[PDB]
Design a protein around this ligand. Sequence first.
Ligand code: BGO
Ligand code: MG
Length: 260
Amino acid sequence: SMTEIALIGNPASGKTSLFNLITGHNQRVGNWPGVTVERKSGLVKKNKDLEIQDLPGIYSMSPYSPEEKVARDYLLSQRADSILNVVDATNLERNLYLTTQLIETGIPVTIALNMIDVLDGQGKKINVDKLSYHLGVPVVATSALKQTGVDQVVKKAAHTTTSTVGDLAFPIYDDRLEAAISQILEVLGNSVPQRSARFYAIKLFEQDSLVEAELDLSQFQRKEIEDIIRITEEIFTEDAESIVINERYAFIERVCQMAE
Ligand SMILES: CNc1ccccc1C(=O)O[C@H]1[C@@H](O)[C@H](n2cnc3c(=O)[nH]c(N)nc32)O[C@@H]1COP(=O)(O)OP(=O)(O)O
Ligand SMILES: [Mg+2]
């Protein structure tokens, strides 16, 4: 059985550059079914038992672009063994916004902390093991330009899979949001897989139109969820989508502070 490694990150994070280094000239290109979004994959040049599934460069997993939808559907399909998340070290906080959402899918994340050579030139520093510790994911510093850390991150990702990793270490948000997520999980029951339950619970909280349309929820489930959102919005005096956005960035800021 092939180990399937999903490669994803923001646009201009160096994902293509790393894809090309990892796979060399041996790639397969097409489209995702029913859409014109490119579907690209390649075997790891130095370990052909590993397949890299490239995913479109995105900033978030929102319902508003074909590229974001392709990434989400693929990651929620449970076909990937590992997520290899390419992160631009020179724009860390902005890049980790997506990372928090990737962790929540329940497919173990490994980070290629890319552009590390640029960071050195800007007079900036990132303490890699502290960043890893506080994100709850492996992190390996890479440079696609200098060609460093690449084989190392691929090896880590290959040994950090849905088979090898036990409990999910997910970003923990404010107690008030966690209460809402917990109650949505109770309402969900077995309507979604345990592995991705948190992804779905957060999406429901923020009234993601794709999840709402796809899930077969009872009238009672929908009423329970509506109630949870209403009271949670009242206690934050903020709309549900904004609450989640603010909590993601707060977590990211805390991690980046504790990692310097
Ligand atoms: C002809 N080329 C240029 C001429 C002048 C200026 C830039 C370019 C140009 O091509 O920049 C590319 C990279 O080479 C560089 N780049 C990528 N990784 C690294 C890295 O680790 N370090 C450095 N210094 N640069 C990197 O960052 C860019 C984005 O990498 P993409 O892979 O495209 O990102 P997505 O796949 O969208 O995620
Ligand atoms: Mg250290």
